[model samples]
Target: GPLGSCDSGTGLTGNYSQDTLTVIATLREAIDLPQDAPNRQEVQDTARGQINDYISRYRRKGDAGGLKSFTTMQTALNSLAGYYTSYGARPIPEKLKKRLQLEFTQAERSIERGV
Candidate 1:
């Protein structure tokens, strides 16, 4: 199934908690993808790229609120990436995964709102 497909049953309302759940669910699905899946790397790259773009845009525009959220999200992404890169494709701890997921979802609303 495609990323975010599970979210259809619980539409995103821009609420922090709900969106965080959505983000975690999507990421869990991504993590479950087979190593040989053609789209695995593509999905990971796209997610990381969008996050980097958001970080850049927020910094350039001097949007304090957006920048804070983006920076937080970036930090989480870096941590998650580091874990995967350093340890191979192992399962991340549930607590750490949830932390990253919430951060990413928190920033997502700001990005969607054009902040």
Candidate 2:
């Protein structure tokens, strides 16, 4: 038997702007997949992976300015991750969707400003 090592999450290459924006874009679309889509589960898995990787990669950065956007990013990430964890296959809360969209834009602006 061939046993591979544990797969926790993907390793990010440390481009906060590129990686965070990419993950935000991915997560935005992942949330809207119709429940009946054949690949919903797979998309959700990728979303979770991106969230995990993004959080781990940026959390240790030692810059206060950089920290602001991550605070906003994590807020949205936890909401979605918590929902998927506790209620798999359930509908997303309308409030959660709106909040995440707003957070994503805020984070984007913060990143662009380098703060």
Candidate 3:
């Protein structure tokens, strides 16, 4: 506990390939709130932590930071998470969802080859 462990709050495994998959999976699970859902705020609150933990851990690492999947994944994460921060529990727009879905596919495929 003296080494400043940062894993306490994250759901990530810190493996680039697996973390990419995990981050996307998490985003998928929490991104579809119905605006009026009772759990929207709670889910959004938790998701923001995961998003922060995931990004904070990888952004300074040489191996994962500059990778294609990480780049692609963060682009989507930033947009979605930023909107959740900016707009709270409101539903995601279709146009944004469509774009992020494509980016998620792009990131997942890159992780398959470690590219």
Candidate 4:
């Protein structure tokens, strides 16, 4: 059996850029809370805001920045998705999942075109 260390709510600490780290931390916090928690919506909103902010900043820097940002963002998003799917008491919000999918698709296209 593969034993893993328990998550201490600080699992996202890493060597990533500040913006990337922020989104990873935000997503981790949001997804760790119970679905019915009173502040869940607020957490979700904050996570979405951070995600969009990163995307906007990345877009301004052209292809290299965009590719790097989107790649990191998509990986973090997938991590959150897996967490919710595996351990969440309720399913992840449809809106959030849909947005992630759309963003990744757009990023893929942009990267392909060297945008």
Compose the digit string of candidate 2's lDDT tens values, residues 27-109: 88877677677777778778888898888777776523446778878878877888887898575677788778888888878
Relative to the true structure, how large is the alpha-carbon lDDT of every model? 0.53, 0.77, 0.75, 0.53
Error of 4 at 33 (Å): 0.8
Best by lDDT: 2
Candidate 1, which segments miss by more than 4 Å at Cα? 1-28, 32-66
What is the alpha-carbon lDDT for the whole of candidate 3? 0.75
Clashing pairs in 1: none
Tens digits of per-residue lDDT, candidate 4, 1-115, equal 6944464322223323444556655665565566778876556555656555555555444433446546646555655545444654454765665555555445444444543
**TM-scores of all models?**
0.47, 0.81, 0.80, 0.47
Q: Judged by lDDT relative to the true structure, which candidate is superior, 1 or 2? A: 2
lDDT for each residue of candidate 1 in 45-109, tens digit (9 for 90 to 100): 54444334444533454434445444565576567767665765455667776676566666666
* Global CA lDDT computed for model 1: 0.53
Q: Which is the leading candidate under TM-score?
A: 2
TM-score of 2: 0.81
